[model samples]
Target: PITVDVYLDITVENISTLKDLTVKFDNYDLHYVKEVTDNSVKVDGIIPGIYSVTVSGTAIDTENNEYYINGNSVNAALFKHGSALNIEVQGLKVSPLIFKEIYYCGSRPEKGGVYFRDQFYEIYNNSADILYLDGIYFANLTPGTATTKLPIWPEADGNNYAYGERVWKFPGNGTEYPLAPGESCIISQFAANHQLDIYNPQSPIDGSSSEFEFNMNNPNFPDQAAYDMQHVFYQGKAEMGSIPQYLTSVFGGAYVIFRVPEGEAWDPVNDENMKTTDLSKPNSNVYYAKIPIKYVLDAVEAVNNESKMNAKRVPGVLDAGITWVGATYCGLGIARKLSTDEEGNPIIREETGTYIYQDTNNSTDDFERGVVPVMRRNGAKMPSWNHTL
Candidate 1:
């Protein structure tokens, strides 16, 4: 391998202040970080190979508002001296809420078959202030599986939206549901203890206490006592018209939580907001909801097979990278990475006194894969209504 010294030129835009910027270069065993000065860093002992360069830190604007400044360039080859890499870090405008954990991959019961009613998604309040959970939407994007062929929308601003199959919303009257910092709310598929069921004794979660549950109205799984999340819209293949339940793909699915602006009602039933995947089709009528990217608070791209990882359903602005469970129905999920302080200690939230999570707009760097799914894993508190004395 050829050895050389590389120069990295970084650009931070749309923000007036930048701080604690570190440029990192990594390839297999070769991993190192250089202190970036004047938006540049000279990295020595660089061998000729593919390297992923990353820059991350906190940024502030003239208004004194804080933002997470992060960016990465993956698989850049550096085989010679004077190799210069230009990477730009953008200040991510993120909301206080994020998907803390997604347990879409259901557990396999020791008795015999698969159990999916135990599937759930945990959302966290990463900000310091109390945030309301009223009227926010959650949905799995169309072609939930990772694939090369993504859906094409008919609108000119198609790229600005993610096509969702079934949209579900949290029901609240502005102040009905509030979450303090470090508190989390688990939205369960069925709010019951799957372990106590006659079927799946090996189930990991007792979701009976979840803050919210899907109102699928499926005859097989009776509705639980937990508050029902509203089923906002349902768009599917023409043959499978208006099913009763929303099945979170046991493999993996691209998930997002968003809020529609006041004026723009999320009416996918209208001709304008609905479209078939293939423009070339003669008369197909399969429609998916055009979820605007601008309204997405957080997004996660999950893959079942690592082989087809390049197939990104959502734009890079929502989630730049993908996370996966490796296989299906093996009782695994993905959780967001925890935040740490200057001395590398997990930053505990003062409000709930639990650990905070990292949100870099990149799922690959922000999630831990194949972990046993647990609500309030790091002692995160439940929402006020769901909390016990």
Candidate 2:
């Protein structure tokens, strides 16, 4: 029963051909046609309210190359008659390695307390060529899951970079760790068999076979068989410099795999590459690693649930869509959606005989939620050095 109306003029830049475009004003969608050669769409009858804009679509270039267009703009109070929103679209490349599964939501034990130590992340080489895992970086983005507010950083070019809470790196000398086509490797918080842990026998994962585990460097927990990954950067510290619980949250978190730009050093200590939460308080000491969006190969955005989808952290080019499991500590995880034919049969790669995972640069369409936590579920082979004893 609303009468007032607002005019929203949306303009998309750097697009050659717009196939399909969707402009979401806080979930109130305005669908546009494929023949939007002008790159601007005027929307009328928009309710007078504050909205965060999410634009997603497919664009084709002069050479007929396909690119997924995505962008998110926030905090627009559309009360006036005309409000112009201009969003620039970038053509992000789909990387060879994609996040295969994310098991951040901890498992709940039937008998007693919850356990989150077994949290892990799986990555797959989705391309045809063999790729090296050396010097690649893995990180969980800031402004953690279950948020409704958008993040604002102190850096001038903040939108060009993703603020990482903690960054972990894979150790190698360029080619020491080679991942073949259709293979996957797991990076875990703990590499021991969780079922064997007397404290939590009801855990869902047996992380002992993980390719690499975090080197917490704590005296309480000894090192396991898997090789320890190098810790690149951390945001905060506990009381008296004590070790914190784990890397990811039980509620959910955003993750990305990226490589440093060529000719630039991967130095976290460089002042130019770091940002503090509050520039007003110089001694706050809370820092986040700033990684440029262009270097990000694959990005996945997972929240606590649909209610928290409004506070998405990953960029649309990195992950145009957001996904989630309903509840935390529910013994569940989110896996990548596998490519299938018309009959829902898995589309297998003839060259490698592995399942082809969907990679449309949108996590909501790329990932499968509410699945049991698992590592190397399919015929994904482990690394050569992975000693599963």
Candidate 3:
């Protein structure tokens, strides 16, 4: 028996903006929902469980300019311990990234009005872990570079670096803290008068590309060796492919076997239309790439496609609600919690101890729910599904 209180704060510059705001919660078993005021809402009596809470806000000004927070979702959980949670809302006239730049640079872009503003980010935590986050600096990278060096100013903050620093700190949240294991933080970019140069070169204004060189010894950080050791390439050049074939013999096959399903074709050479076929059947004809460099690079496009599809399926469940399934093939073991509907009906199900859900909408009535295969890991065998639709 755990007690958790979820407090929500919604703030807007003008009263009219409240008209387009909405919020929703999933996976929490409770009742007695309440909204204390136009700017505050609360939900009590939640049972111990994992949940995803989302808020959406959309507004249009007199000039007909539209704005919104798209599928702004956050994942959290309520445990059997006494835990308190706080959700904050803020309304700003500019994007945080631009604020970061202008605060440091002291000027706006020359081409100008404000073309790249109006976005937001959210943070979350599931446990009672209090995050201590002081002395941490926020920044926006010029792409292909390290966090140590960013542009001196962004166009939105009017080139006022001090103003940017002022806005970065979390004002009233319990503690200007560090995030816990299941926690996240979000920042918004909505400066109406700021623009972004997404195509800016990777090199800094001083003409040097760090390429994550200093992080080389830190395995947790991305380094040049890891980038060069990637299995993908572009335009007949190894933009980011495996560290030369000779390196493989010294370091056991650092990559995994990849393949494309039958009927679905993929070509890495073509930047567009690069995806693997939806082959739901096992041993149905997988085009496995040979070991070493050449074949791995050739299969990169198909591998990329599979990776994307796998990410899309992680949160889904089978026919029976008690069990859960995660991503596989491209990269395995990425798990997400499964939620139930308002009536407590499990949103997913597994039958016969297999992770297969019934076709409520009959979208895939013609296909068979394939068998779960045995996965070999560290000399141990475990059964898993291939995520066939």
Candidate 4:
């Protein structure tokens, strides 16, 4: 009952030997391929509605070496006849570590004291090739967990930029901590790998068994023995007496993973020049990073579910939408849903031994609520989604 026309122009930059590039739409399974060398395609009768478009194929270099053109999803929701959507992808990351699961609302005790230390994040290698965890850093952004007016992650001050209060990095060089496709590393707050303390005594997970633990605990303080852990990173000692500033936030916040710029290392001297602080606010002494957003590998803004509207931390270009979690201490988290094929058989890979996951950057399409609070060590868990989508 309507006329629809769309143009897809995928210009891969810096590469000269891109060949046989094909495009696919969410509404249809048929891939539109290029009959010529120019990377352009046109299609008609698309039902005049919103759809996810993916342009992927192989790229051969000068020596006939081949690599994949894994272009991410682009929503053609606003398309009309003569309308052109241009997608440009330069550098392709083979095996990027995805923030698969987050359980920040530590387990709540049914009877007594607060049990919040079991908060953890699971990072899965969503690609087929093997990957490394070297030079990777985790950031917890703030307005100190305010649900509103704080989504833009402490923007620039007409000068440098914003910084994460706790910028924890993995201790490794190239290939030091390798992760195969579908495999994930569970990074715990304490790395003790025990169940969260709940009055009900039904522990969520055995966190103490984590593959690697963070070593931020104070080794010298006898009273801080319970907090002691091996292999911690940069537990900043504010002033001379201030304790190690550990990473903490149970309600809801934002997270970003990035790599330090090549040839540039984090230093107090150089960082102080780049930092901007507010004198009026309490805890103003606490410094944040002024790093540019472009360096971020992956970013997700998570807020408490009760918020009336999403408080966006990162720009829409990074993540068009925001994800959320349950109340403090609630056994709830957000995770990427396993993407199924047109038949929806929970697509499994023989080579990677993991389920295929969707990564569209749209939280509604890419993530699910209370889904995989605990990492699926063996993928024997229930469906990532009940009704196959």
Q: Which candidate is the best by TM-score?
A: 1
lDDT of 4 by residue, 1-389 (tens): 23333343443344566554555556554333323245555555555555576555545555433344545455556346655665553323222557777777777566666666566777777655665767677777655474555322233344234446556666665666667666766766655534433223544765654444444444531121122222212223222234442445666667777766778765422555444444445555555555556566666667666462455555565567767676777777787777565696665543334665666666656778765466554372222211111
The C-alpha lDDT values of all candidates are 0.75, 0.71, 0.25, 0.55
Q: lDDT per residue, candidate 1, 1-389, as tens digits? A: 44434343333344565555577778778886766545556677666788888776655666544555557789987877767777766554434789998888788887888887778899988764678889999989878677887455676754778888778888887888998877888998888878885748888888888889886677767788888887766654322245655676787888999988877766665555453454545475656777888889889998876665678886799899888888877888898988765698875433235566888888889999999888888878877687332
For residue 55, model 4's alpha carbon misses the true position, in angstroms, by: 15
Can you tell me which runs of candidate 4 are displaced by over 4 Å?
A: 1-95, 149-162, 196-200, 218-247, 264-269, 278-283, 306-310, 345-353, 377-389
Residue-wise C-alpha lDDT for candidate 3, range 98-139, written one tens digit per residue: 110001111223443321111222222221223333322221
> In terms of lDDT, which candidate is strongest?
1
- For each candidate, what TM-score against the reference? 0.74, 0.72, 0.19, 0.64
Q: Report the candidate with higher lDDT, 1 versus 4.
A: 1
Better of 2 and 3 by lDDT: 2
Query: What's the CA error at residue 60 for candidate 4, in Å?
Result: 9.7
lDDT of 2 by residue, 1-389 (tens): 11222222323334466655566666355322222334566666666666676665556556544444456567666666666666655443324688998888777666788877878889998764588999899888887664776555775765788778778789988888899977898988877788875646777888888988876765655577888777777763212134544558677788999988658875654565454564555566677777789888789889888776677888777887788888878888999988765699875544456666788888778888999887888878887767673
lDDT of 3 at 279: 31
For TM-score, candidate 1 versus 2, the one ahead is 1
